Design a protein around this ligand. Sequence first.
Ligand SMILES: COc1nc2ccc([C@](O)(c3ccnc(C(F)(F)F)c3)c3cnc(C)n3C)cc2c(Cl)c1CN1CCC(C(F)(F)F)CC1
Length: 221
Amino acid sequence: ASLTEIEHLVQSVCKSYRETCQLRLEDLLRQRSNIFSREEVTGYQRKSMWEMWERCAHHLTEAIQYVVEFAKRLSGFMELCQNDQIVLLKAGAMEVVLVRMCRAYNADNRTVFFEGKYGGMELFRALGCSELISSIFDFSHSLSALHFSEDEIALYTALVLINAHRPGLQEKRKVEQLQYNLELAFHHHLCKTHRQSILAKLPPKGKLRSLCSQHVERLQI
Ligand SMILES: COc1nc2ccc([C@](O)(c3ccnc(C(F)(F)F)c3)c3cnc(C)n3C)cc2c(Cl)c1CN1CCC(C(F)(F)F)CC1
């Protein structure tokens, strides 16, 4: 694994994310002024849990679609066997989406972009998952404090997908080979941008899975 190869890997990863990030970001930052009025927030709270769960379920499904496209555009990922690709996506797709969401989170007023405007966590009262949604707002808040950059998100969510310790793989050493090169590109790029400091400030990652596995009680696919 040469150096210019690692620099290519970085650019190759940052372009894949730019093409599959779902929302441009400058759109997100621009609309931070577009906030839900107390009346609009009530319209969301009066919805039933089934109405809200369906809306959200449709957002995740669409989000996960962009993550698969992101994975599908990663060099090396397509070279894996089909079993590994499904194993990795089936385990990491959701975690990547949780990390991607921090971009829609505005730490100024503790609101997230949701269907055209920004709202606080009281917007999802109908789901009945007060604690779960609180935890997500904390996570997104932690990542926003770092001023996570587009390329940092692209390299990091790549390291969330390409995890050689996922159970079910059968060409493990290939995922390890790929996982290390994405760590090299991540570290290398952080050096070029004087951003080695965000490493210690990153949430572990067992918590990233903890929000899913520990707090998820899936009843719809
Ligand atoms: C705070 O809670 C949420 N906040 C969201 C923020 C943005 C988007 C959104 O889909 C989105 C916006 C920007 N970027 C992303 C991406 F990058 F993440 F893909 C997604 C979106 C919104 N409005 C539009 C037009 N869009 C596209 C969906 C969101 C959802 Cl569903 C939820 C509720 N969830 C959370 C996790 C779930 C769990 F089970 F895991 F707990 C269950 C319940």
